[PDB]
Amino acid sequence: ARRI
Amino acid sequence: XARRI
Amino acid sequence: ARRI
Amino acid sequence: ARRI
Amino acid sequence: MAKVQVNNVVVLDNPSPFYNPFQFEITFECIEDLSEDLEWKIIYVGSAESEEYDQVLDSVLVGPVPAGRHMFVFQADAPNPGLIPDADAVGVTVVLITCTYRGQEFIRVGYYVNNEYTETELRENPPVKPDFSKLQRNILASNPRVTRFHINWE
Amino acid sequence: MAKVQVNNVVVLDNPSPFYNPFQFEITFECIEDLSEDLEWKIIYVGSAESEEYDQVLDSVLVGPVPAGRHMFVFQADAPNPGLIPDADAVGVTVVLITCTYRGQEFIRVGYYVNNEYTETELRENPPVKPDFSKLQRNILASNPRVTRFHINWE
Amino acid sequence: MAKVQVNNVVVLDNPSPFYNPFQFEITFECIEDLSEDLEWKIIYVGSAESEEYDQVLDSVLVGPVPAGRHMFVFQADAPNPGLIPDADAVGVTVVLITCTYRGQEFIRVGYYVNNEYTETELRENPPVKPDFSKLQRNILASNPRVTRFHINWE
Amino acid sequence: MAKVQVNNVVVLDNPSPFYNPFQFEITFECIEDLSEDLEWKIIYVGSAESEEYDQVLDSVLVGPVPAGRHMFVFQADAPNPGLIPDADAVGVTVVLITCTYRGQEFIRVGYYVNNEYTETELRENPPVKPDFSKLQRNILASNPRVTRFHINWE
Amino acid sequence: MAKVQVNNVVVLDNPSPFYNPFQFEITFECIEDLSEDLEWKIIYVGSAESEEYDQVLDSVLVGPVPAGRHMFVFQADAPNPGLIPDADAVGVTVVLITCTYRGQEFIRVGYYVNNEYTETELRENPPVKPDFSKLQRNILASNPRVTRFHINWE
Amino acid sequence: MAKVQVNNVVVLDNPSPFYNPFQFEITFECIEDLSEDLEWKIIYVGSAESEEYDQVLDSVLVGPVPAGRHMFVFQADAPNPGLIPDADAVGVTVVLITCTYRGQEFIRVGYYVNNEYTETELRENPPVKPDFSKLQRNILASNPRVTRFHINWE
Amino acid sequence: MAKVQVNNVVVLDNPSPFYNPFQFEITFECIEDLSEDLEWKIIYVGSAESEEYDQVLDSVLVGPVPAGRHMFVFQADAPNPGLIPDADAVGVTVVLITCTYRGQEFIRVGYYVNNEYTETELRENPPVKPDFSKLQRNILASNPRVTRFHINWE
Amino acid sequence: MAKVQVNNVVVLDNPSPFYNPFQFEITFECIEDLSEDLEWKIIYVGSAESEEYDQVLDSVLVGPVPAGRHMFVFQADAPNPGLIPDADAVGVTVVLITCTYRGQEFIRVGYYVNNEYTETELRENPPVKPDFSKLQRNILASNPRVTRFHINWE
């Protein structure tokens, strides 16, 4: 999962 | 604590 | 002494 | 305002 | 790619006195043999105002699950009236049924539950403090709300 | 009670060619500090008839979250046409935004997505095999369906 | 020491079909002759959730008012079901009778109104869309809530 | 549809001698710019027996009101003991804060007020005629009763 | 690193008879929650010649302070004329408002205060002994002197 | 004095692939209502050696601006690699966020941006021609450089 | 791209008495012939507290500009002490030299300016009111701050 | 009336190298015998911008104090340059001498301190990083600021  | 049927 |  |  | 499918939920003993336990005839299917257990829960939304008055009436573990169709009756005692705010006692509330696999909820069946007095005298002149022994619980069974969730089935 | 509240979701770049990534400007607010993650997801319903053709276009982790109002643009690549059944390619489908806290989805914002041809020739005589390079995705942004779930907040 | 005092409000034709007009026999006293008019209103709280669904069923001007006791029947047509949210149609709502002098409301008589189906087939299994032609409006006349306001009586 | 929302009321200088003015720090929100003024009032219920002994301690006009959150201290002189019936002087009474928009009161914040002697001699043997200069007013601030009214915000 | 900031001080009821109590509406901001108290004081400089004739008109405790903006009216009785030297009674003097945190004064708002007779007879021919019942106090509110002090905020 | 103050800038989606758009959550305050517009810009320094390679990634007009606190997410597409000289592609460069009022830049928030390979093979033996599809952009968000400029606000 | 580059700025007659005019020898290169004029300005930041005490000491127009290197001594009279707040008179302030093309400022050269007394008894016992005739202005010429702006050059 | 009065403070060894300890000869009177101790402090305001860079150079307990005149030299080591922000190193800062009784500060003597280079070369062209070994501390002893506070003296 990508992290903003 | 979720009993078992 | 007084409290608001 | 002034011109050199 | 889900291993469990809930085919039907039948609301038994309905309508009934408020204090009667909840009874649901759950029918489900299992695509393949399950290594873990299925955790069922019946939650009662006591107060619409707040989620802290939600009561997990019971939690049942069903396992091991072989592949095939299964059926069971989930029984859970009625909610504690001591935790139901007076304003939310008479009228429409919600009861939920949730199945979980490996700690992840994959299905949630919600039902509107209408609690009402049965006597004409109480229906016209209700008491200031709700009389739970005179309140009839009517789960609106013909209209459930089913919600499925994407979980890791491995 | 609920620690996170989603205030607004704005659909950006709409309508757009099918292949354009999805863009949603999300505004949410936090009641208290979260020294824990929130997991946002975009889920495309490739085929309405089956759950196996649902595509998680992207999964984003947002955390730790300090108390207060926060705003961000959740962008996710277009769904893989290779996984979209021909019968479900042209017409109305669904796109979802779902936030998870502690393994529990607490909110789900759904939008109907109408993918239609723009050229008169294809609109009157559509091909048997869908041409994704000629389709226009118009997310029906003026009518989202917001669903909240009673979870366990700590 | 206000110029107008409301002595009694009698709820006429009750209970009745939802569509029957409201009838209230309003009796009031007047200390001295009134220079302006008394503006009476019947307001129906269609949605408890919001004030935007309140319907002013009728607005009547009573004037000039000589000193003494007066009596009249305030009649107003039933609320428009087209403006009543489905969720707030069946069950308890509120009807208000308000008097205003020189643009200032000085009294407000509220009544709980219970809208219910009369057959126990719909009582147990109500329709998703409320049937207003099968509903009975029962104003709980034995328990009004009277509220007086401090206004400028010149 | 309401344009004004009262967020908080803080009771200041409490408890205090009976003769000290009332002080309330009011915080309120405004959805739009307000065309008309907000009229705030502090009313003291001098006698439970009759609404004729209610004293409007002060009436303040707040306007024009721009959209946004506002804060102010509503101060009003202590009630006239000359209008307080002896039987209702020592013990519990009520103080109200009311806001009105366009001649219609939309909110009313009520507080129980306990007037008691502080000296042991007077607490054991109170005088036949109440001594207001020896009374201590204690507003029971931890338990306000907020009542909202459905008004025409046009 | 200062936890408290005084935003504004508004001089209320000004000018007024000498004997009227002082009224100051104080607005202040608090960076973080204070588990301790702020101690506000109103001091009247009775004699410029000596600091022994300064009168602490009142001392108020405000606490605990939650983080945010707060507002209150500091009211204190007029100074004792018995302690004001005759020479320093009529004319300009100083009134101070001071806040203290953990025994350390961090702010001091000073105002020049002009006490003058209002009657023409008294303005032309003032009495040898000052008549405080005929003196008008005018706090020169448009020009306060704010002084901040470096203190230990932990 | 200055009508606009930038309170906070939060660097979102960081680090990220080079090709991901820039996302900054910007909070700013407005002292009074603004007659004109505020023009926000994101500029990427493509070459430290030459100003001609600076790329304005996006320019947004925000207006009219009412007095108060505002928040938005300023998003801009990644710089065009076709305009980035090879020598300046891998390593530390600068991205700027500027705001202009009436054609005058009053604030500039600069961040060092470190573009590096993530794979061990490329980190040890980088290609002569930079591979933008394998570069990770890491904005050094913990250390912005804020520069304010004296502009004519009226 | 940037049709004008400033090569050097030399601070002439420095340090000097406060009242001496500012003298800067500016060298600049012009890439192409300029269709419009370059507007040079010398601005004095009189008060660090507010931008309203900034004084434009002089504004010169130089044009038309042929391509090539040019040099000119920009001289501007000392700032008006009448507009310099006493607190900001002795100590470090800022002087700016700004060039503008077609109404857009493209370069700003800032210098710290240290105004100090030269006499020992003044340096140890400075006057309450600054004596500008005894102050020495020292521009810290060895450390200018150059800021370039992106402007539209056709 | 206050039990302690500070008569005089004499600044010893002044001017001196930055690194020399502070020396103050304090003369004070005692009206009555003191039950507790007098806590003397020397604080150096390292940064005018913030109170977090204030350094308590020394804290001394003086007690028991008999009635009468007393004299002592309060000495405290120079401030740590490692805690002095570069921008606030050269120029005018403040040193404070503050006496306390029972945790309440009753007096504060402030002095402007001018830290300057002694060599003309450094005075005209100071280094970007301050050289504390070439700085001279000059306490402006001819102009102290004395502030008295009203404290509780039992």
mmCIF file of C-alpha atoms in Angstrom, chain E residues 1-2 43 45 47-52 54 96 103 108 147-150, chain F residues 1-2 43 51-52 54 56 103-105 108 147-151 153-154:
data_model
loop_
_atom_site.group_PDB
_atom_site.id
_atom_site.type_symbol
_atom_site.label_atom_id
_atom_site.label_comp_id
_atom_site.label_asym_id
_atom_site.label_seq_id
_atom_site.Cartn_x
_atom_site.Cartn_y
_atom_site.Cartn_z
ATOM 1 C CA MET E 1 -12.986 -15.354 -4.821
ATOM 2 C CA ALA E 2 -14.724 -15.771 -1.396
ATOM 3 C CA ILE E 43 -24.867 -6.507 17.535
ATOM 4 C CA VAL E 45 -27.584 -0.619 17.942
ATOM 5 C CA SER E 47 -28.738 4.342 20.468
ATOM 6 C CA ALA E 48 -28.718 5.951 17.038
ATOM 7 C CA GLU E 49 -27.099 9.068 18.668
ATOM 8 C CA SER E 50 -23.963 7.075 19.659
ATOM 9 C CA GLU E 51 -22.049 3.919 18.680
ATOM 10 C CA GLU E 52 -21.002 3.434 22.372
ATOM 11 C CA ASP E 54 -24.101 -0.784 20.625
ATOM 12 C CA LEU E 96 -26.773 -6.582 12.826
ATOM 13 C CA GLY E 103 -10.386 -11.686 12.051
ATOM 14 C CA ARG E 108 -23.029 -7.928 7.563
ATOM 15 C CA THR E 147 -23.178 -5.757 2.854
ATOM 16 C CA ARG E 148 -20.197 -7.794 1.645
ATOM 17 C CA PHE E 149 -16.547 -6.883 2.237
ATOM 18 C CA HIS E 150 -13.357 -7.699 0.365
ATOM 19 C CA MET F 1 -17.414 6.804 19.460
ATOM 20 C CA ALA F 2 -16.364 7.548 15.782
ATOM 21 C CA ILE F 43 -12.517 -0.513 -5.848
ATOM 22 C CA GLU F 51 -17.265 -10.378 -7.262
ATOM 23 C CA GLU F 52 -14.105 -11.898 -8.801
ATOM 24 C CA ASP F 54 -13.681 -6.298 -8.745
ATOM 25 C CA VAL F 56 -8.695 -2.686 -6.095
ATOM 26 C CA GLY F 103 -9.153 -3.681 10.045
ATOM 27 C CA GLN F 104 -12.706 -2.364 9.952
ATOM 28 C CA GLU F 105 -14.225 -0.491 7.038
ATOM 29 C CA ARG F 108 -17.921 3.467 1.785
ATOM 30 C CA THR F 147 -22.635 4.187 3.886
ATOM 31 C CA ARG F 148 -21.307 4.242 7.403
ATOM 32 C CA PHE F 149 -20.623 1.131 9.474
ATOM 33 C CA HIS F 150 -20.740 0.653 13.239
ATOM 34 C CA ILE F 151 -17.190 -0.490 13.942
ATOM 35 C CA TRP F 153 -13.186 2.450 17.735
ATOM 36 C CA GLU F 154 -10.546 1.238 20.258
#
